[PDB]
């Protein structure tokens, strides 16, 4: 009847170690034979978690542990192990094992988007705001393991990382230095959100940054254009109204971006004059709302559109009924 070197074992085991990890070695001695002692787990309900090598006495995980999967306060498993002499003589030696599961950081921070966009001026001074990134951490709140911090990464795109920075706590992305870059360029800046858990986990996203002078994005003369009624009878080419913007050093190109799916209207993209393009019918349709936009030649020639507050407007077009002659009185009901 072997006797265990210790009559109880306690061991602390990190959650999320992989299947196979040896976590404890036990030992009993046969005082007579001094050899060939063998071991066995006696509490059959824990063969769900562990295996015990019959000759080495090494205990290992059959599956990784999960701290959060246990009832509150109960993240520990206690059980009996037994040791026999070579013959398997009855009663064996018996000891207690207690495996306590240590809580660990489970999740990385996750960004609200895979790709953020922003803009910056070619000559922007150090500290110009560009955009904010944001990540959340699924781990227990208020702990170092769910505390988010941001930084840039220079492994894949080192240059952007040298002209842009992100504030460690707020996730505001800003210019690191006074800029001197080419209008129309689009940088990819890689940002990383990391926590403060054991271990540390992180993920990353991309901020695409377009270089362009804010002043070279056109400003419409109005937010809402409300030209006079257009007659139901208007022939093709009749003028509806005219939109207009100014931009610094730029030719401007005008367009209709939505609301005109029937091609009932058209726009001269250079003059900004909106005209009747198809047939009109008051019974069929009495009013329209077009979304128009103004862009710089430079931006167009670069196959870009940049919709801002000021280079987008709505045009309200109201049709005039020409077949409206209600009678003097009607014997109605
Ligand atoms: Ca867990
Ligand atoms: Ca955990
Ligand atoms: Ca975390
Ligand atoms: Cl940074």
Numbering used by the authors: 795 to 1127
Q: How does the study describe this entry?
A:
The tip of each stereocilium is linked to its tallest neighbor by a ‘tip link' filament essential for hair-cell mechanotransduction. Immature tip links are likely formed by homotetrameric protocadherin-15 (PCDH15) proteins, while mature tip links are made of cadherin-23 (CDH23) and PCDH15 heterotetramers. CDH23 and PCDH15 are unusual members of the family that feature 27 and 11 EC repeats, respectively.
The solved structure of the human PCDH15 EC8–10 (2.8 Å) contained 333 residues starting from Ser 795 (EC8) to Glu 1,125 (numbering corresponds to the processed protein) followed by two histidine residues that are part of the purification tag. Overall, each of the three EC repeats shows an architecture similar to that of classical cadherins, with the typical Greek-key motif comprised of seven β strands forming a β sandwich fold. In addition, repeats EC8 and EC9 feature an α-helix between β strands C and D, also observed in some of the CDH23 and PCDH15 EC1–2 repeats. However, a comparison with PCDH15 EC1–2 and other cadherins reveals that the distance between calcium ions at positions 2 and 3 is larger in PCDH15 EC8–9 (8.48 Å versus an average of 6.84 Å for 41 canonical linkers). In PCDH15 EC8–9, the side chain of Asp 933 in the DXD motif, which usually bridges calcium ions at sites 2 and 3, only coordinates calcium at site 3 in a ‘canonical-like' architecture. The canonical DXNDN linker motif is DMNDY (897–901) in PCDH15 EC8–9, with the carbonyl oxygen of Tyr 901 coordinating calcium.
